[PDB]
Amino acid sequence: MTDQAFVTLTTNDAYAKGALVLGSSLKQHRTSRRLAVLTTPQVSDTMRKALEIVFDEVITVDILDSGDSAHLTLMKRPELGVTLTKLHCWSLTQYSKCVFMDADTLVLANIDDLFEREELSAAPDPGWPDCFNSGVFVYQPSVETYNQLLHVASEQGSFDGGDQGLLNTFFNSWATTDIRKHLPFIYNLSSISIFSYLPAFKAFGANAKVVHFLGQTKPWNYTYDTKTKSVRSTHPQFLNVWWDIFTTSVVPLLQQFGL
Amino acid sequence: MTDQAFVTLTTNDAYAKGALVLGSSLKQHRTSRRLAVLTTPQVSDTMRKALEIVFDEVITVDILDSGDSAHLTLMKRPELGVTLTKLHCWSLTQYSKCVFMDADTLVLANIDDLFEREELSAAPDPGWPDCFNSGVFVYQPSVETYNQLLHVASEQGSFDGGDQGLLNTFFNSWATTDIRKHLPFIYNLSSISIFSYLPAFKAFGANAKVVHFLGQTKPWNYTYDTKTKSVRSTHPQFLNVWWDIFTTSVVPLLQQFGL
Ligand SMILES: [Cl-]
């Protein structure tokens, strides 16, 4: 399916690692869809070159450039830089439908059945569950929607200073409309919810299709012991999946660029 | 509307205070429905007498008694005592439809529009938002459903040792079925979500219809300064509403029993 893609975003090298693990995880679970990554010029050439191998398409977005449609909004709302860059996922009109996934998510199972969903489908955010979590969503590229989102970003900004606020504001019927636009939580399982509601994780977590690494420490911020195959200093299994992919597939990939 | 009620539960004197504040809060916001409270014999006579004034119906449930239908299940699963007592809300067949509200909830606005909903309607639980939070739900009394719930309690218990696990297990299509059975989060606003996702609270919290006091410290565990009209040692406004009702309406009510 060439006109459908998973789309992610990396604005730096640290998140490129996440994006590389994510992309690898999607390939590992045999997606039949394209993989696209939005990148900024702040992503270094070696990460970019690795991204070009993992992803079918690497799209460079430079909202710091005057030529960018989001640039004026950036000047108005400089804290929305990441948001405005992410919003360019809607510019990818070479695709009819996409699943956006933040670079700090990890695919545990094939999730191509997401492409049955309509814009805007997303899992509930823990914390304020009448908002959707913007880490994973099904959307449809459209210059119009992009422009409309830009306009809301310009006019109202984001109630949380992030892309999630903006997206919830724009796609505001999510909470009260169409249960099919509630992605099951297992398609965007907040790593924090392992703690916040442990019995529920015990009951339903084995079904996790996507893990979303939230909180202060991102997976790449951990130390991974390659001998014991575990991160150190915590329910580590998801981190360990992330690190195994990173160790097995991503590092060896980045290593071949030194030659 | 005589065949519809808000129903709560108190198993002790501390929660009776909550139940009294809840009942008062419902009267304050002019419910046209009946108010029913399930009570246990562990609730003292003075609390019971106060409950008889606030609530239209005080129902005594004694699952420790052999004569109780839930009693055998209690012996099997003694940790489910509170759950099994709460499940008796389904025994209240004098009502055609009820909103169950835990005694640690607080009504901030008329919520009689809940009676438009069907069993089982409930707000998402923060933490694991594909579970509903069992603090507030619309249900329909039925001996059959009661029996079915008892049976699931007996057979499977609760994945979280509480009523929420059991109810989610029984009413398991909630996450994926019928958006109208997702009560808006503002009908069961987790006091913890004030912290967990503060920008969202800032954005949507002013619309709170029901506050659900979760976490270690219940409202009655705080110290309330009646002069400054605030609790001490925190976004205190909801606690302060709880305490104002408690101070204005509940304490004076309990005071008239000493004569
Ligand atoms: Cl629906």
DSSP letter string, A159-193: TTSSHHHHHHHHTTTTTTS-GGGB--GGGSEETTH
- Pairing mode of beta strands A132-139, A97-101: antiparallel
- Pairing mode of beta strands B210-212, B189-190: parallel
Residue among A51, A60, A52 at smallest CA distance from A19: A51
CA–CA separation, B122 vs B132, rounded Å?
6
* B163 touching chain A per CB within 8 A: no
CA–CA separation, A192 vs A86, rounded Å?
23
DSSP one-letter string for A201-222 = HHHHGGG-SEEE--SSS-GGGS
CA–CA separation, B185 vs B122, rounded Å?
9
Scanning every residue of chain B, which has its alpha carbon at the shortest distance from the alpha carbon of A131? B200
Give the closest-approach CA distance of B139 to chain A in angstroms: 19
Whose structure tokens read 């901030």?
B108
Amino acid at A244: D
First to last CA, chain B: 35
Residues in chain A within 8 Å Cβ distance of B203: 159-160, 165
Residues in chain B within 8 Å Cβ distance of A182: 175-176, 179, 182
CA–CA separation, B150 vs B156, rounded Å?
10
- Pairing mode of beta strands A223-225, A210-212: unpaired
The beta-carbon contacts of A245-248 under 8 Å, at least 24 apart in sequence, are A245/A21, A245/A24, A245/A25, A245/A28, A245/A106, A246/A17, A246/A20, A246/A21, A246/A219, A246/A220
Experimental method: X-ray
- How is residue A24 written in tokens? 């690898």
Residues 6+ apart with CB under 8 A from A111: A29, A31, A99, A187, A209, A210
Q: Is B62 exposed, middle or buried (0-12, 13-18, 19+ CB in 10 A)?
A: middle
Q: Is B42 exposed, middle or buried (0-12, 13-18, 19+ CB in 10 A)?
A: middle
| DSSP strands (E only) in chain A | 4-10, 34-39, 57-60, 97-101, 105-107, 121-124, 132-139, 189-190, 210-212, 223-225, 230-232
Q: Is B221 annotated as a binding residue?
A: no
* B128 touching chain A per CB within 8 A: yes
The neighbouring-strand residues paired with B34 are: B5
Decide if A212 contacts A190 (C-beta within 8 A): yes
CA–CA separation, B91 vs B147, rounded Å?
9
Q: Is B113 annotated as a binding residue?
A: no
- How is residue B229 written in tokens? 């009209």
CA–CA separation, B181 vs B173, rounded Å?
10
First to last CA, chain A: 35
**Resolution rounded to one decimal, in angstroms:** 2.1
| Helix H or strand E segment including B124 | strand B121-124
Q: Is A154 helix (H, G, I), strand (E, B) or coil?
A: helix
For testing the chain B interface, which of A79, A130, A187 should be mutated: the one with the most B CBs within 10 Å?
Answer: A130
| Helix H or strand E segment including B35 | strand B34-39
A–B interface: beta-carbon pairs under 8 A: 102
Residues 6+ apart with CB under 8 A from B172: none
CA–CA separation, B133 vs A130, rounded Å?
13
Q: Is B164 annotated as a binding residue?
A: yes
Amino acid at A144: E
Closest CB to B127 among A161, A175, A193:
A193
Q: What angle do CA A69, A74, A75 make, to 5 degrees?
A: 110
The neighbouring-strand residues paired with A43 are: none
B216 alpha carbon – ligand 1 mean position (Å): 36
| Cβ neighbours of A186 (radius 10 Å) | 20
Whose structure tokens read 């989060």?
B185
The neighbouring-strand residues paired with A10 are: A39
Residue among B197, B247, B6, B221 at smallest CA distance from B112: B6
DSSP one-letter string for B67-99 = TSTTHHHHHH-GGGHHHHHHHGGGG-TT-SEEE
Cβ of A124 and B131 within 8 Å?
no
Decide if B96 contacts B3 (C-beta within 8 A): yes
CA–CA separation, B94 vs A83, rounded Å?
53
Residues making up the binding site of A: 9, 11-12, 15, 77, 86, 102-104, 133-134, 160, 163-164, 212, 215, 218
Residue among A73, A39, A70, A75 at smallest CA distance from A54: A39
- Which residues have C-beta under 5 Å from ligand 1, the single-atom ion? A 178-179; B 179
| Helix H or strand E segment including B154 | helix B143-155
| Cβ neighbours of A5 (radius 10 Å) | 27
Residues in chain B within 8 Å Cβ distance of A130: 124, 184-186, 204
Residues in chain A within 8 Å Cβ distance of B201: 128
In order of their start, the domains of chain B are 1-259 (3.90.550.10)
Scanning every residue of chain B, which has its alpha carbon at the shortest distance from the alpha carbon of A189? B128
Q: Is B160 annotated as a binding residue?
A: yes
Give me the phi and psi of A45, to 5 degrees please: -65, -35
For testing the chain B interface, which of A83, A116, A128, A202 should be mutated: the one with the most B CBs within 10 Å?
Answer: A128
B149 alpha carbon – ligand 1 mean position (Å): 26
Does the bond joining B108 to the residue before it have cis omega, within 30 degrees of 0? no
Q: From its phi and psi, is residue B89 left (phi > 0), alpha (psi between -120 and 50) or beta?
A: alpha
Decide if B139 contacts B102 (C-beta within 8 A): no
* A128 touching chain B per CB within 8 A: yes
Decide if A99 contacts A115 (C-beta within 8 A): yes
* A199 touching chain B per CB within 8 A: yes
* B200 touching chain A per CB within 8 A: yes
* A159 touching chain B per CB within 8 A: yes
Does the bond joining B80 to the residue before it have cis omega, within 30 degrees of 0? no
**What are the CA-CA distances from residue B19 to residues A217, B16, B245 (Å)?**
41, 5, 12
Scanning every residue of chain B, which has its alpha carbon at the shortest distance from the alpha carbon of A133? B129
For testing the chain A interface, which of B125, B130, B196, B212 should be mutated: the one with the most A CBs within 10 Å?
Answer: B130
Residues in chain A within 8 Å Cβ distance of B156: none
Q: Is B214 helix (H, G, I), strand (E, B) or coil?
A: coil
| Burial A57-89, CB ≥16 within 10 A → b, else e | bbbebbbeeeebebeebbeebeebbbbbbbbbb
CA–CA separation, A185 vs B175, rounded Å?
9
| Helix H or strand E segment including B58 | strand B57-60
Q: Is A224 helix (H, G, I), strand (E, B) or coil?
A: strand
